[PDB]
Design a protein around this ligand. Structure first.
Ligand SMILES: Nc1nc2c(ncn2[C@@H]2O[C@H](COP(=O)(O)OP(=O)(O)OP(=O)(O)O)[C@@H](O)[C@H]2O)c(=O)[nH]1
Lengths: 831, 178
């Protein structure tokens, strides 16, 4: 039986009430003196609350007959009505009402039975409850009625019952919220549509936030079309909201897309409105007085939606009207052309001013005015950028509008003048050069003159735009696309699936999973590059031959033995370019000649020494001295490898009859270069370039020279831990095991540089280190600063690291000797 | 019409009760009340046909450590939850929840969600934690925890200020559908 102590009694009663032993509790209740109303615990919840919450109907009637109060409220103010109401136990409701349970009681926040019942939307219970409830429009502390939450959760049947009962349809909240306002907040369709039928009023909140403010922010296109159905006037308000910078661009695209597929008429309306507002902003943008940042951002913002929405075609559920909307834009283009003429007249003024400057030079306030024009040029640079995007979407991709090409060349001096005045203009607005190779040639020399740093980031943003990124999404790719091969024979296994599997599927994925294993980690995949890379330069495959210096690799002249070397070299190009696409490093050091082949830059005389230093010394000497009087008797014919046979072949058609002299010695050395290093392995290079350019377009990579490409492609050659800590000599580090940190600093400097790299190799998975030092460490989720986590020390414990995350688990070694011994042992085993 | 079952599992005093009451009523309780059982509902749309969302919650007591499994049957999604300001609960995921949920229902997708983001943003909270020599849980390793426990996605949300609350259920419904 229950003890005399209530605390033990409830602990005994509490487990049975769930089991619903109707008989068992009866004897204990009858033959014990414990008070049912007693509150237990800090929450002070009565036993009736627990019984009411669960479905044990029997215990309720026994407890109530014993004197349990159904009206009792705990500290939270919730009564047995609320707990039973949430679970919708109709039996509990009937018995509660039978024994004098009143439904009008409210909690501390004002929530009552109707509110909890409304949230769950049990309309059957609502039918009977409303007949008993005194008032159905009871407001909470924040002044919100029952219908407010019911509409928010989108219970179509709940609202119908409440309206039939006379529930208020236009009750404003404390802030002024309308039940339509809350319905649009969570993007409910049925409830919103029902409210319009009854004639719900449209009013803004007291705070000044209109209902459409959240709808556009929420991006629920379903609610927009119903709203616009009865209020076409608000359609224009959507266009006006584009000007405000507080709204996210991504949301506005999706909502505008959904409206587009509805009918072509609205599709035209969206385009026309965007062009009209764009025209107004453009004229405002040109004005010097108007805010410069806000206007260009607004114009670029609007243009982006117009460009994207234009590319989205309609559906049945391609004629002039797509060009008519450009007529409002041709007004903008016409002004741009006139401005391009006006600046051309400005060049005449500048040229006229140049006459005064040049005249003074020959015989040997304006700064502010030039700055304003330069600022105007910056604003002019935004509109021309918009014009390019409109032209780009004017037809399928990969083609530049012939109209675009003709006038841009017609104003070549204008563009070249602006870049000189403001080199940042290429790195601020004038970005579209990378698409058209013809326009690249005009500005490539200008761009290359700019600092390399400004060139690096501009390259990154363009290339990464087309990435099949999944890092932040971290959604696994379809297994059909993910390769599943055994690591054994990495070179053979990787190529087999790539060639056999569909090309489209492979290029759409990034995951690298081994057959029969679930392993997936950036460090593990980064290690996969290392093993694969080493096999490529492995002399056994004979694909690449060690350089004379012994620090670089280039394709072997004997690689032609393998019948499928074209295909395998093509596969290698794909893998190497894939690493560059996502920016992981490849440990291979290629020769200077090889990197030039990637960019297509012709080799020079110095590259000859890569194979035969003695022959190069002859080619540099011949150029450095006149040979007309030396009687060399050497024509344009040199021995070269032809399909493995040493034969005498002219360097050019009829070269054997052309004597080499001072006039034509410069090219003679040049021709000899490709004779040795390029033609010999030209078939191999052709396949390799084919694979590499699949992911890295030649124009984009051409921007950088051979040296810059290797630094990006292979990484920083020189490293030092001082960069990570940005200091040289402190008495303490992060205030974490500082004496151990000092020993950690003492050991790293003592150990040679080469073995410190291996320590980074284990944690990172790549022998090389990214450019920029420790400030640009790529971990599992891309940019991730290197960190070390302390661990309790145990005897013979070696450090460990989860390679996907570039972090280290360093035990709290009590002495430096243990610290250095343990990491040395890890190096031996970790090799 | 179709219906799905979703469950919230996590340590006590984490914010599971606040997450569902705040989402469904915009009201934040002022007092501290553990629970024994709860239920909620919502709606979504699929191909023009409404789809109902059913949400269940569970407590943390030893007796309910066995009844909580009894509420799993025919569950279609799980939302493992932990307190972003309490490292012990986060550590308990490996010790208790990840083995426990997988032992009973390993097949169904798992979503990791962090609550108490409001206390995570409050400056006074870190001050008292600093005096106690404690640091809040962070994002990048939390995603690693999600991978370690096999959770499909990791999210962070608030219940008082509702920062990122709505995304929690959007990813849950999106993840289960696809
Ligand atoms: N300010 C703030 N407080 C929170 C937040 N989440 C939880 N809390 C507080 O933490 C307390 C404990 O959470 P509960 O509301 O009891 O929910 P629970 O921890 O899941 O408890 P059970 O549902 O019974 O398991 C609550 O009373 C809240 O006051 C939050 O996101 N912001």
């Amino acid at each position: 039986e229950l003890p005399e102590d209530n605390e033990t009694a409830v602990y005994t009663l509490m487990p049975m009430v769930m089991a619903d032993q109707h008989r068992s509790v009866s004897e204990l209740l009858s033959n014990s003196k414990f008070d049912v109303n007693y509150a237990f615990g800090r929450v002070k919840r009565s036993l009736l609350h627990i019984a009411a919450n669960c479905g044990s109907v029997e215990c309720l009637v026994l407890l109530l007959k014993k004197g349990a109060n159904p009206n009792y409220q705990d500290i939270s103010g919730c009564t047995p009505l609320h707990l039973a109401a949430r679970n919708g136990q109709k039996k509990c409701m009937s018995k509660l009402l039978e024994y004098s349970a009143d439904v009008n009681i409210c909690n501390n926040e004002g929530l009552t039975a109707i509110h909890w019942l409304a949230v769950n939307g049990r309309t059957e219970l609502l039918h009977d409850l409303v007949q008993h409830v005194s008032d159905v429009d009871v407001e909470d502390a924040m002044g919100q009625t029952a219908l407010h939450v019911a509409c928010q959760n989108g219970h179509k049947t709940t609202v119908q019952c409440l309206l039939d009962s006379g529930a208020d349809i236009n009750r404003p909240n404390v802030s002024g919220a309308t039940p339509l306002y809350f319905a649009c907040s969570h993007g409910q369709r049925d409830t919103a549509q029902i409210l319009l039928l009854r004639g719900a009023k449209y009013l803004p909140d007291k705070n000044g936030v209109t209902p459409l403010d959240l709808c556009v922010q929420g991006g629920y296109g379903e609610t927009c079309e119903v709203l616009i159905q009865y209020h076409p006037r608000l359609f224009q308000t959507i266009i006006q909201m584009t000007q405000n910078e507080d709204l996210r661009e991504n949301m506005l695209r999706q909502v505008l897309e959904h409206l587009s597929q509805q009918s072509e008429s609205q599709y035209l309306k969206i385009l026309t409105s965007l062009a009209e507002v764009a025209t107004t902003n453009g004229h405002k943008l040109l004005s010097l007085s108007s805010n410069y940042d806000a206007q260009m951002k607004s114009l670029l913002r609007i243009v982006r939606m117009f460009c994207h929405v234009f590319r989205i075609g309609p559906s049945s559920p391609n004629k002039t009207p797509r060009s008519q909307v450009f007529k409002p834009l041709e007004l903008l283009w016409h002004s741009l052309d006139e401005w391009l003429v006006l600046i051309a007249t400005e060049l005449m003024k500048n040229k006229r001013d140049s006459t005064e400057i040049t005249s003074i030079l020959l015989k040997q306030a304006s700064a502010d005015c030039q700055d304003v024009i330069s600022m105007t040029a910056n604003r002019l640079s935004a509109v021309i950028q918009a014009f390019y995007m409109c032209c780009s979407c004017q037809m399928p991709p990969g083609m530049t509008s012939p109209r675009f090409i003709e006038f841009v060349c017609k104003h070549d001096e204008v563009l070249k003048c602006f870049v000189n005045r403001n080199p940042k203009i290429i790195f601020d607005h004038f970005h579209f050069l990378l698409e058209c190779p013809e326009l690249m040639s005009r500005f490539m020399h200008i761009i290359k003159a700019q600092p390399f740093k400004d060139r690096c980031e501009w390259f990154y943003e363009h290339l990464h735009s087309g990435q099949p990124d999944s890092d932040m999404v971290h959604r696994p790719v379809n297994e059909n696309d993910i390769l599943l091969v055994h690591r054994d024979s990495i070179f053979r296994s990787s190529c087999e699936v790539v060639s056999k599997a569909n090309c489209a599927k492979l290029k759409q994925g990034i995951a690298v999973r081994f057959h029969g294993e679930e392993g997936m980690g950036q460090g593990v995949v980064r290690e996969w590059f290392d093993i694969l890379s080493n096999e490529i330069v492995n002399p056994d495959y004979a694909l690449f031959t060690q350089s004379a210096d012994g620090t670089t690799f280039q394709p072997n002249s004997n690689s032609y033995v393998n019948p499928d070397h074209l295909n395998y070299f093509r596969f290698a190009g794909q893998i190497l370019g894939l690493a560059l696409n996502h920016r992981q490093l490849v440990n291979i050091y290629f020769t200077r000649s090889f990197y030039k082949h990637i960019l297509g830059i012709p080799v020079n005389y110095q590259d000859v020494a890569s194979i035969d230093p003695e022959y190069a010394k002859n080619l540099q000497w011949i150029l450095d001295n006149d040979i007309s009087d030396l009687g060399l008797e050497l024509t344009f014919s040199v021995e070269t490898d032809v399909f493995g046979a040493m034969e005498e072949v002219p360097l050019k058609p009829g070269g054997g009859s052309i004597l080499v002299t001072q006039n034509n010695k410069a090219e003679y050395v040049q021709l000899v270069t490709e004779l040795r290093m390029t033609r010999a392995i030209q078939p191999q290079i052709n396949a390799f370039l084919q694979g590499f350019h699949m992911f890295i377009p030649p124009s984009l990579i051409q921007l950088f020279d051979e040296y810059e490409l290797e630094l990006l492609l292979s990484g920083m050659p020189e490293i030092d831990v001082s960069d990570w800590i940005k200091n040289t000599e402190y008495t303490s580090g992060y205030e974490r095991e500082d004496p151990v940190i000092q020993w950690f600093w003492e050991v790293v400097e003592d150990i040679t540089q080469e073995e410190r790299v291996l320590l980074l190799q284990f944690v990172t998975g790549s022998s090389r280190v990214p450019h920029g030092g420790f400030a640009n460490i790529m971990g599992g989720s891309g940019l991730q600063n290197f960190t070390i986590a302390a661990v309790p020390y145990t005897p013979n414990l070696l450090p460990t690291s989860s390679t996907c995350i570039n972090m280290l688990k360093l035990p709290e070694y009590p002495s430096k000797e243990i610290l250095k011994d343990r990491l040395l042992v890890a190096l031996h085993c970790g090799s | 019409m179709q219906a799905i079952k979703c469950v919230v599992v996590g340590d006590g005093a984490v914010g599971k009760t606040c997450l569902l009451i705040s989402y469904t009523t915009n009201a934040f309780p002022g007092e501290y009340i553990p629970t024994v059982f709860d239920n909620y509902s919502a709606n979504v749309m699929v191909d023009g046909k409404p789809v109902n969302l059913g949400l269940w919650d569970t407590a943390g007591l030893e007796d309910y450590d066995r009844l909580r499994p009894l509420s799993y049957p025919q569950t279609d999604v799980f939302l493992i939850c932990f307190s972003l300001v309490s490292p012990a609960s986060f550590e308990n995921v490996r010790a208790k929840w990840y083995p426990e949920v997988r032992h009973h229902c390993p097949n169904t997708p798992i979503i990791l969600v962090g609550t108490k983001l409001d206390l995570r943003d409050d400056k006074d909270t870190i001050e008292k934690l600093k005096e106690k020599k404690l640091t809040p849980i962070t994002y990048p390793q939390g995603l690693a925890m999600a991978k370690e426990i096999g959770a499909v996605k990791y999210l962070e949300c608030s219940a008082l200020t509702q920062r990122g609350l709505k995304t929690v259920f959007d990813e849950a419904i999106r993840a289960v559908l696809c």
